[PDB]
Design a protein around this ligand. Structure first.
Ligand SMILES: CCN(CC)CCNS(=O)(=O)c1cccc(OC)c1
Ligand SMILES: CCN(CC)CCNS(=O)(=O)c1cccc(OC)c1
Ligand SMILES: CCN(CC)CCNS(=O)(=O)c1cccc(OC)c1
Ligand SMILES: CCN(CC)CCNS(=O)(=O)c1cccc(OC)c1
Ligand SMILES: *[C@@H]1O[C@H](CO)[C@@H](O)[C@H](O)[C@H]1NC(C)=O
Ligand SMILES: *[C@@H]1O[C@H](CO)[C@@H](O)[C@H](O)[C@H]1NC(C)=O
Ligand SMILES: *[C@@H]1O[C@H](CO)[C@@H](O)[C@H](O)[C@H]1NC(C)=O
Lengths: 533, 536
């Protein structure tokens, strides 16, 4: 048998599989357990390290996807299904994946760790868009991705209780990270050069590892694509988590914390998923029922508090957004919007849409939003009202939280690089009005255009290769700039003074200044004073 | 009579007048200056509505400007032309209710459209006799009949104890109205057409014009209206009855007059100068672009607030011309905002900007103030002194003039009026204020009146041509309700302002350019959002 495909890790022996990439083979080790299955009475509990095994464990296939809600809005539609679980659902889902070049690296090689997104209620490391073979083959990287518990199973919390202390899904991630420290050298990885990257909820997870001390010895650099630990959707207070859990329990017939959690533990998985969405306090979009909680433990204070006071001198961060962050969410509840027409909306529908997109807003706060985003030269034009609705959602939930994070990190000594991703895929199945939606940079970072069967353009292939190089160069050095290329133009560090960032698209890098500066001043500076009164 | 110019003798309702033959660059004009239109509002008549002038005997000499109404005189920059040109140029007196008439020489054959000028000056100052209001150029070049009147200002014109008989308020506006009635009766004697009367005025003069539009008994007295950098709506042009009463009661205390009858009777014993000396001490907050004694919402001259009145009115057959200059706010900054001077660049700090906003928006709560600061800050360069200086100017200009105008143009258009809007962007080569002030409040006036036609004034040839264009627009509008020339389709057109398209034009050396949206985004802040905020 192939000795390249055989590895001994602390828990026992593994057999991987030789996979084909367009320019050569890669070694893949898929479905490696990093924890005891969090089932039965381990539901809602922190993960425990996997017990050693006998013989040779088969690591040639993806393991099960963590139990989660499955999307039904557009059945059979490629643009939604590409995010749906592509393996069997199970609470037994704590496994990770490793790609390395074939043969395994001669020298200790920088490690990239992918943390998938999905609103803390969905996602899996087995999706096609997270295929690590391209980065491994082309850039010679060691790539790791783990599954972590989502929804109630990962984030249901009765703060203070022993049996549901919250944030266990984040603890799953942390265990996977510890696993990398202990075992990655056997694959050729360098545990002293570990870069986390993630998107949406994944980016916010990365952010929370930055902000949580026990995670700090497990990585060296971070990438946050379209998501932040701060902001309106990524965390909840202990009181609001307690409320939601208690509500969900009542909804499923349960019933002290111990009694309540015991009854929840007897409920079949889908019974919990059936009521997951019924515990949000307001009708809303870009809000998720079970997300990380400010527990005073994993998170000692709010992300905002923690980014304001931190010391980040030896940290390097790459952060960014896509061109149309908000468009994807509108078709999931805002009247007037559909992937099947041009979604031209009235003025009235725009005011209604705002109460949904900013569900915490007072009447006055919502008025401020409407008045800010209305183009008063064309206050009733449906095309603008549509594009503004999208902008309200994108800015409130991604762009401005990102601008706030970038600035706090830079000011606190961190080395920050910022981007905006503006290329819309030729193969994109969503309508034109949605532009470049949340999530559609990922396929380019992972190098999917290199797969000739996917029908991307030749320029898109060249573009994907550029992005893979930025990301890996960042992983190697904390600087995305090619140390060979002497004719660029260079990607400068984001600073509070100059506020420089770059556009990523088919044209060469362009340097811009101010990331929605005026509009984010409204969100980040004015609106809080308004709600505080 | 006998051996005098037979073209200079005219009779009006109150008696015979002798006028003067004046030289304009292109030929002579007739002037009749210091024609009384009211009984002197002195003594027991102070604070009272004006009474029509009683007929005189003999030929009244009307060859010189009469007294300027008693008023505060500016002392900020002594000897400086930039300020002096606005200061009284005749003796101050409470006996000041006179008006002036310029007509072609000889007087016109057929009835001629009449222009009536109402000066500004914050309702505390001004005079129709000033050099920048010289009607000879419009009379000579355009053949217009021009009329300007003195009206009472400050305490004498606007001190009010609402509901009382002895100080009902707004008497300064009734002076104006009385002069408008005088024109209806008498202007035909000078060759003027009382059926074509166009009001125009600047700043508080503009606001005055707007108040005549909003007050029924003035409506039979004119046909068209021009409002230059001022509106009856907005934060400075009116006060409530409650606030007017509070200010009058305070000023009374300050001068030694602690029901309404006895208070006012004590005030009438006070020397005019005593009232002026305490006028500024009754403002409720440290402020700029605020004036102590202004028109009051009395339920009489003004049946409701101007805001309410422009919201609900029918303005079907009204044609209006409105507009602003490029830098409405700059002039006011040197009269109160620390950091600002005509004698340096006035580059200011962020702190000074925050302090300036509280003064420039004196009625703002802390939250509203912060909304202002956040809106006007440049978040790419939030500490930049040049930007902060220019933003301070924009705050004051937008809040007080540009957005109230936008609001007025919008409401009047929506209610059936034909509206024409402009921005005036040319800075006089002769301006004595520093460059950073740009095109300040009041500095289009000298062009509308045609002062650059006076060769002794050192304007450029382009400015001379420019001035003639503006005179054409104004007089065409007076004549027809349209500033465009029907014998000049070749020249670019000035479209009406509409809610749908929001068109206005640039006024400078270059041919008319059409722009859309009168600071639409920023004015949505001032006009739509800020009132909601102050409510809570
Ligand atoms: C992996 C991230 N995306 C790609 C956009 C997959 C979907 N997850 S999501 O968080 O973006 C999302 C979208 C729509 C409605 C949602 O709440 C019901 C949540
Ligand atoms: C020089 C300061 N040290 C030691 C006091 C603290 C660590 N500083 S850091 O910038 O390397 C950093 C900060 C936060 C999260 C991190 O993820 C690894 C890394
Ligand atoms: C003056 N009748 S009207 O619409 O022309 C009208 C409406 C209001 C005020 C005025 C003079 C005229
Ligand atoms: C009517 C002519 N103007 C200048 C346009 C002469 C000054 N008068 S003012 O009202 O514009 C003004 C300006 C600055 C500071 C002020 O203190 C209150 C008052
Ligand atoms: C788009 O589709 C949805 C439902 O399919 C509908 O509610 C909306 O009115 C449509 N918009 C247009 C452009 O007709
Ligand atoms: C300009 O002059 C004023 C008044 O003397 C002063 O307060 C301000 O500091 C000066 N600013 C500059 C730029 O020197
Ligand atoms: C115009 O120029 C002459 C040149 O001597 C000067 O004397 C005069 O003062 C100037 N005009 C004005 C109003 O300053």
């Amino acid at each position: 048998e192939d000795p390249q495909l055989l590895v001994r890790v602390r828990g026992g022996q593994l057999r991987g599989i030789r996979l084909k990439a367009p320019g050569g083979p890669v070694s893949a080790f898929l479905g490696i357990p990093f924890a005891e299955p969090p089932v039965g009475s381990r539901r809602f509990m922190p993960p425990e390290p996997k017990r050693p095994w006998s013989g040779v464990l088969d690591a040639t296939t993806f393991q099960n996807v963590c139990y989660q809600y499955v999307d039904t809005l557009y059945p059979g539609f490629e643009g939604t299904e590409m995010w749906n679980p592509n393996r069997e659902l199970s609470e037994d889902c704590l496994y990770l994946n490793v790609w390395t070049p074939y043969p395994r690296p001669a020298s200790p090689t920088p490690v990239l760790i992918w943390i998938y997104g999905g609103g803390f209620y969905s996602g899996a490391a087995s999706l096609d868009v997270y295929d690590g073979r391209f980065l491994a083959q082309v850039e010679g990287a060691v790539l790791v991705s783990m599954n972590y518990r989502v929804g109630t199973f990962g984030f249901l919390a009765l703060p203070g209780s022993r049996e549901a202390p919250g944030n266990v899904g984040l603890l799953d991630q942390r265990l996977a990270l510890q696993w990398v420290q202990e075992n990655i050298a056997a694959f050729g990885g360098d545990p002293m050069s570990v870069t986390l990257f993630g998107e949406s909820a994944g980016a916010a997870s990365v952010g929370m590892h930055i902000l949580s001390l026990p995670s700090r010895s497990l990585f060296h650099r971070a990438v946050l694509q379209s998501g932040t630990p701060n902001g309106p959707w990524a965390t909840v207070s202990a009181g609001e988590a307690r409320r939601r859990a208690t509500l969900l329990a009542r909804l499923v017939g349960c019933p002290n914390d111990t009694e309540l959690i015991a009854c929840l533990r007897t409920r079949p998985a889908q019974d919990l998923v059936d009521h997951e969405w019924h515990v949000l306090p307001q009708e809303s979009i870009f809000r998720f029922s079970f997300v990380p909680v400010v527990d005073g433990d994993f998170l000692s204070d709010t992300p905002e508090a923690l980014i304001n006071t931190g010391d980040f001198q030896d940290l390097q961060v790459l952060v960014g957004v896509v061109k149309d962050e908000g468009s994807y969410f509108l078709v999931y509840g805002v009247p007037g919007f559909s992937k099947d027409n041009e979604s031209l909306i009235s003025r009235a529908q725009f005011l209604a849409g705002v109460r949904i997109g900013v569900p915490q807003a007072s009447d006055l706060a919502a008025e401020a939003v409407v008045l800010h985003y209305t183009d008063w030269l064309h206050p009733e034009d449906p095309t603008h009202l549509r594009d503004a609705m999208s902008a309200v959602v994108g800015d409130h939930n991604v762009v401005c939280p990102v601008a706030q994070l970038a600035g706090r990190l830079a000011a606190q000594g961190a080395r920050v690089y910022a981007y905006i991703f503006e290329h819309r895929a030729s193969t994109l199945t969503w309508p034109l009005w949605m532009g470049v939606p949340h999530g559609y940079e990922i396929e380019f970072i992972f190098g999917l255009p290199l797969d000739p069967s996917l029908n991307y353009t030749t320029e898109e292939r060249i573009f994907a290769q550029r992005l893979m190089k930025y990301w890996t160069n960042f992983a190697r050095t904390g600087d995305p700039n090619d140390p060979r290329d002497s004719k660029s133009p260079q990607w400068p560090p984001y600073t509070t003074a100059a506020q420089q960032y770059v556009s990523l698209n088919l044209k060469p890098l362009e340097v811009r200044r101010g990331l929605r500066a005026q509009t984010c001043a409204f969100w980040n500076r004015f609106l809080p004073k308004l709600l505080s009164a």
